[PDB]
Design a protein around this nucleic acid. Structure first.
Lengths: 82, 82
DNA sequence: CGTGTAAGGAATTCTGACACG
DNA sequence: CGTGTAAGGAATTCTGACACG
């Protein structure tokens, strides 16, 4: 159950994903991932979010807009619940 | 492999374990766990360290000195490698 | 449209110490 | 011996903006 527990701040994610804080916080602004937040506002990510970020980055490179990606991901969640 | 990846700063550990930063940093000073460190000195813990902390706290409550605990844990590592 | 940067501040962690015991 | 606290500073994150495009 460790995979989905939100426990690592943005700095760690930046390293694990090789992405800038600008990119990471933006994808979230595009509703591509929903990190948790501490009462003091610091964003908390889980290992699952770390991978989600790598998928987003992959599609971004392949010249894909967040919207398209946002849809792709949406389709993947309904099936997971099945 | 998420279980052992060092990714969460002391604040998160404090919450997950209900232990004070004083206790956590001390157990490490007693060589009861070895957190990673970022180049900027911030300590990094893994889910495995989180559990290790709960075992330490458990024995501490049962009136056990870190030394004894340190030994108990030592014995558990050799067997794991087997 | 995705992303880089400088800006000012708010919250986090770190270390060594004094304390009691 | 394990742990609480105040102290001063160093590093982290957050947000909104200007930029190009």
């Amino acid at each position: 159950s460790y995979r989905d527990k939100k426990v690592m701040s943005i700095g760690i994610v930046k390293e694990l994903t090789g992405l800038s804080e600008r990119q990471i916080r933006y994808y979230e602004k595009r509703s591509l991932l929903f990190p948790d937040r501490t009462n003091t506002g610091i964003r908390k990510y889980s290992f699952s979010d770390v991978e989600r970020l790598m998928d987003i980055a992959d599609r971004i490179e392949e010249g894909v807009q967040t919207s398209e990606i946002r849809t792709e991901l949406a389709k993947k969640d309904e099936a997971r619940k099945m």
